[PDB]
Amino acid sequence: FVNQHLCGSHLVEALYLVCGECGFFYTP
Amino acid sequence: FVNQHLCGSHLVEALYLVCGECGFFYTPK
Amino acid sequence: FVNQHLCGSHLVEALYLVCGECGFFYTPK
Amino acid sequence: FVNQHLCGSHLVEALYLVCGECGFFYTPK
Amino acid sequence: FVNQHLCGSHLVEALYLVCGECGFFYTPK
Amino acid sequence: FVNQHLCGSHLVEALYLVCGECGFFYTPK
Amino acid sequence: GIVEQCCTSICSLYQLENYCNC
Amino acid sequence: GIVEQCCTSICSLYQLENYCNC
Amino acid sequence: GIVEQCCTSICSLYQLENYCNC
Amino acid sequence: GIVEQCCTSICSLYQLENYCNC
Amino acid sequence: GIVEQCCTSICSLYQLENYCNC
Amino acid sequence: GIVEQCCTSICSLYQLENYCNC
Ligand SMILES: [Cl-]
Ligand SMILES: [Cl-]
Ligand SMILES: [Zn+2]
Ligand SMILES: [Zn+2]
């Protein structure tokens, strides 16, 4: 689903800013 | 120099695309 | 038609990454 | 050449908005 | 409300480009 | 300066996220 | 507000310019 | 997952922090 | 075109290469 | 300003929140 | 090209429009 | 890490794949 695909792109950017030096895991 | 904070933002967008359904861990340091 | 506009924004970034030095063409619907 | 790569990502997003219905070719060379 | 939240991100990206050194006022009310 | 320009694009997307319903004035000068 | 005006239909350049602080 | 949680409604700072790798 | 092909179902990297200008 | 503070070093979300219009 | 023109000094909207395919 | 490798030189798509969780 493309709508999910577009949402996920914004999610990973938010995780990048929120998590800082910790980094994050993105698991769809 | 390369602003590593800005570059990282693009890296995680690129991993999102390349890795597809695999996903990824992002470990800056 | 907001949907297609938002989709296109992401498509262009993806083509930028995938196509490398070949570049790409973007023609909206 | 990393900074040029990062810049080009932003350029194609700007072209997408600026060019509207016309679309555009992105030609890194 | 996610559709408006994702669209708003592209909005401020557009305002940033459109407004340049004038800056801009983002008020979602 | 393009480096400042690219940085500001990321700053406003970050402010969009952080500021939520308050929104923000982006005042580069 | 700007979300109501610009996320149901794509806003023109002129509409976006309303929000600049020139 | 994060998609069903955060693409159907807006996730707050606290909700997003759940996915950090501290 | 790419919008018809890629804005409802996700286009893979391989499919997106169809729209490169090589 | 925000460019001087946040483009030469990383500003956290908390530093960025000072620039909101609450 | 657009990279040489627009990646050290900021390109205006009018400068970017030259690269469109109208 | 990926920052040391891919923010000093451009990483290809294949090289970015190195960092996926496949
Ligand atoms: Cl979107
Ligand atoms: Cl950048
Ligand atoms: Zn989007
Ligand atoms: Zn950038």
Curated annotation (Swiss-Prot), chain A:
Source species, domain of life: Eukaryota
Transmembrane segments: none
The name this protein goes by in its record: Insulin B chain
Organism field: Homo sapiens (Human)
Included range, full protein: 25 to 52 of 110
From Swiss-Prot, chains G, H, I, J, K, L:
Cystines in this chain: 6-11
Name under which the protein is recorded: Insulin A chain
Full-length numbering of the shown residues: 90 to 110 of 110
